[PDB]
Design a protein around this ligand. Structure first.
Ligand SMILES: COc1ccc(C[C@@H](C(=O)NN)c2nn[nH]n2)cc1
Ligand code: NA
Ligand code: NI
Ligand SMILES: [Zn+2]
Length: 330
């Protein structure tokens, strides 16, 4: 078996290997990449997402979110307080202000230490789930707005045409902006491109060990667990690497830099944080191997995890027994 220790693998496709997206995902899995839950893909040197980022300042962040923590430094939840709209240029200025800017630091490890020590004492603001794309329409390879759709994958594998669409999202981050522990909706894959700015540090649990993280989370967030059997779906809970190690949870970490792609694999729990002002683009996708994960994915039906209307068809077709209860949640 390839990659038995479930290490995060890093790939360097040539320009020829970068033509056929589906083929390269399958190649990475042939090498065991999916066992880690996350892989990095460094594009060939000839490739670019777009010509420049000089003209992005007028994009609107209609509802910036202030991420307010509660708990202890290594075990906390966050809620999102809505703020007034601002442009990307205004957000970049805010991120660089004395209140929000990245502190002096020696290297990524020092910054990671500072994040886990001090995150809860600040409330950074970020732009999330903004429908749109920064790929140039003429970028033909790994253009996140031109991937095959999940609806077409389901139809090709299972024979059923379904409603729904599948478009990318933009994210604008700053120092300490945080993504809580989660898997994707319906345990889909995701792909994430860091277009511009400072890094993003990721943590990931191998899919084969996801239920170990779930068990720890139920212990550490006991009221949340009583409220919902799939509360990690709410995307609010953080657990530090120190606490994971103390509890024996298998995980890995890696830092993504501008110009790099990250792929998350079905049922790969992940979390992380931004180092400073940045802009990323991400979308969910499927392959034939996903279908079995989609059939088995847990669901939140308590009301908290509202999602896109595209997920209706996925539950309806893949999880008909669960559909009525889940639909009542939505
Ligand atoms: C508080 O929790 C969340 C906040 C934001 C995301 C979005 C995240 C991701 O992993 N989405 N699937 C991402 N971060 N950079 N680009 N995307 C996920 C969880
Ligand atoms: Na490891
Ligand atoms: Ni994710
Ligand atoms: Zn719930």
């Amino acid at each position: 078996a390839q990659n038995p220790n479930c290490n995060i693998m890093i790939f360097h496709p040539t320009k020829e290997e970068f033509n056929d997206f589906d083929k390269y995902i399958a190649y990475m899995e042939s090498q065991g990449a999916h066992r880690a839950g996350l892989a990095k893909i460094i594009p060939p040197k000839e490739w670019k997402a777009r010509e420049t980022y000089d003209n992005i300042s007028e994009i609107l962040i209609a509802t910036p979110l202030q991420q307010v923590a509660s708990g202890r430094a290594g075990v906390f939840t966050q809620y999102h307080k809505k703020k007034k709209a601002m442009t990307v240029g205004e957000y970049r200025h805010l991120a660089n202000s004395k209140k929000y800017q990245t502190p002096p630091h020696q290297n990524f490890e020092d910054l990671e230490r500072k994040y886990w020590k001090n995150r809860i004492y600040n409330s950074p603001i970020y732009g999330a789930d903004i429908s749109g794309s920064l790929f140039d329409e003429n970028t033909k390879q790994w253009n996140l707005g031109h991937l095959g759709t999940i609806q077409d994958l389901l139809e090709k594998e299972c024979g059923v045409v379904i409603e729904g669409v599948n478009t990318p999202y933009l994210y604008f981050g700053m120092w300490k902006t945080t993504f809580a522990w989660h898997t994707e909706d319906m345990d889909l894959y995701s792909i994430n491109y860091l277009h511009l700015g400072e890094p993003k540090t990721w943590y990931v649990v191998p899919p084969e060990h996801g239920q170990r993280l779930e068990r720890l989370a139920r212990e550490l967030f006991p009221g949340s667990s009583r409220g919902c059997g799939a509360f990690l779906r709410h995307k609010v809970a953080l657990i530090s690497p120190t606490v994971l190690k103390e509890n024996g949870i298998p995980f890995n970490r890696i830092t993504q830099e501008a110009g790099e792609f990250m792929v998350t694999f079905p049922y790969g729990y992940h979390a992380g944080f931004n180092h400073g002002f940045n802009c990323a683009e991400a979308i969910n996708f499927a392959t034939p191997r996903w279908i079995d994960y989609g059939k088995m994915a847990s669901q939140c039906s308590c009301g908290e995890a509202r999602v896109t209307f595209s997920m209706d068809a996925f539950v309806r077709i893949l999880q008909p027994e669960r559909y009525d209860l889940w639909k009542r949640g939505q």
